[PDB]
Amino acid sequence: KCPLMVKVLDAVRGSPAINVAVHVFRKAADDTWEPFASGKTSESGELHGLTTEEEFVEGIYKVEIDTKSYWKALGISPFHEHAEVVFTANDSGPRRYTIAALLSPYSYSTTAVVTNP
Amino acid sequence: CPLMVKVLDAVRGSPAINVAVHVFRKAADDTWEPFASGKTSESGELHGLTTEEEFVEGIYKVEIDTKSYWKALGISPFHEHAEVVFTANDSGPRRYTIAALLSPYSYSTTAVVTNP
Amino acid sequence: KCPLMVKVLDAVRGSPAINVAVHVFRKAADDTWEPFASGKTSESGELHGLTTEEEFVEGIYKVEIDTKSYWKALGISPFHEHAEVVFTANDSGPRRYTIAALLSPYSYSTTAVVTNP
Amino acid sequence: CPLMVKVLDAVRGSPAINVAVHVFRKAADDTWEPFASGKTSESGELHGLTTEEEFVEGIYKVEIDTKSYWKALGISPFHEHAEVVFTANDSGPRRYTIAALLSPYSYSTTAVVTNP
Numbered sequence A, C: 001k002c003p004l005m006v007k008v009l010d011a012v013r014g015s016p017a018i019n020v021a022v023h024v025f026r027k028a029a030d031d032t033w034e035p036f037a038s039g040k041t042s043e044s045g046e047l048h049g050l051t052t053e054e055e056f057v058e059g060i061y062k063v064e065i066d067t068k069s070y071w072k073a074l075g076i077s078p079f080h081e082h083a084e085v086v087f088t089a090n091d092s093g094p095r096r097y098t099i100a101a102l103l104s105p106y107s108y109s110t111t112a113v114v115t116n117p
Numbered sequence B, D: 001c002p003l004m005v006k007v008l009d010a011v012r013g014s015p016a017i018n019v020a021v022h023v024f025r026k027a028a029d030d031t032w033e034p035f036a037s038g039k040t041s042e043s044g045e046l047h048g049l050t051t052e053e054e055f056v057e058g059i060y061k062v063e064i065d066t067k068s069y070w071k072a073l074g075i076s077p078f079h080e081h082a083e084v085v086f087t088a089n090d091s092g093p094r095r096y097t098i099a100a101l102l103s104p105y106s107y108s109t110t111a112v113v114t115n116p
């Protein structure tokens, strides 16, 4: 899957970032964050299967990538608690979203690739 | 001078001017308490957010309102904002600069932590 | 293919960067750049098939991504002439290299993912 | 002040200090003629590369010796260097800053072009 994919790379080692926890939240009508989906990156640094076309409705989503546990498992003390990405999804109908992240101990960058299925 | 934010625009090749920035500190109940805020200057910098006495160790979030910035320029943005969350640890003397580089569908952020 | 792949994304549109020309050079024994391989990114922003295991020997390689023609075709006046990446390849035996690039009109970033086949 | 380079280190969270920077201009035969060079300061900045009279329109390459920088820190690097190639165009008054953010297997660069 499918409509929402996350890909994570490590800029120190030149590798996929493997076994990174990713948590997705959706803003509820009362303005709180409701848990939506979560998972871990594979050996290729990718996380497929978060959601389905049925479940992934319009809304404001937050994707939190647990960069802190990643670095700590490699024995490194990182700066950021996580890398987040917050965006409005599916406003003009369903789209496929890939959230890509590139990690360093004191920096991260993220991009979105949005395609019309 | 303990906390400074600096923002650049990767589309126009310029400082990101008049961008709203809010800083929050994580409270004991895990909620975010507003801590400081301002708007970037003509140089894309925001100085004077806090003081040495106020800025204690803890977990902080710097939220940069990128969506309003892109909309004021007529450019279509992806993200609601950019949120930068980090732990401040006392080691010896430190100044923190949070630097960010903005594009419509991407952003990057780095921390520059120096000893005055 | 295979040992050398290039992937290009557009940070303005949130899309793959399609039909981007990529030229690869290898440093010759006289210290000049010898043409090595070239191609164009596909609809997915990827360029496979540049080289083969046989041809891709040790050496210092330059990958030049024609970012200027990309932007000009979209009607935009960009800053950089190209995005390059220069690196020593295969020094401790064959590796697979992915050179990924993220483009904006006044900025680019690049990362390398190196895996042991 | 027409050309400045500023370099940051994404691993250590610091300015990239004592990094060698060479600038070349593209010659009529398509070769690169050395034009200016220096080493970044304690702030990671390199000022005084050129003068307004010298810096004419044309195609320039800023080569940042990232490999020597990482090796002096004991960190294993991927790239030989970082080469940043751009066209300078006269529009009205302009100052150029080439900013770069370094990691061992990645770098990014942006241009900040302002009107003094």
Ligand SMILES: Nc1nc(-c2cccc3cccnc23)c2cn[nH]c2n1
Residues within 6 Å of the ligand: A007, A008, A009, A100, A101, A102, A109, A110, A111, B106, C007, C008, C009, C100, C101, C102, C109, C110, C111
């Ligand atoms: N945020 C971010 N993600 C990427 C990036 C991450 C994962 C897969 C990709 C595939 C192609 C191009 N990019 C990536 C890259 C690469 N250079 N800079 C970047 N910045």
Ligand SMILES: Nc1nc(-c2cccc3cccnc23)c2cn[nH]c2n1
Residues within 6 Å of the ligand: B006, B007, B008, B099, B100, B101, B108, B109, B110, D006, D007, D008, D099, D100, D101, D108, D109, D110
């Ligand atoms: N290429 C590049 N340069 C920067 C960057 C480098 C040097 C000084 C700056 C001052 C303000 C904002 N940015 C910078 C930053 C920061 N986050 N991501 C980046 N990417």
Ligand SMILES: [Ca+2]
Residues within 6 Å of the ligand: A058, A090, A091, A092, A093
């Ligand atoms: Ca709608």
Ligand SMILES: [Ca+2]
Residues within 6 Å of the ligand: B057, B089, B090, B091
């Ligand atoms: Ca402390």
Ligand SMILES: [Ca+2]
Residues within 6 Å of the ligand: C058, C090, C091, C092, C093
């Ligand atoms: Ca060898």
Ligand SMILES: [Ca+2]
Residues within 6 Å of the ligand: D057, D089, D090, D091
């Ligand atoms: Ca001109």
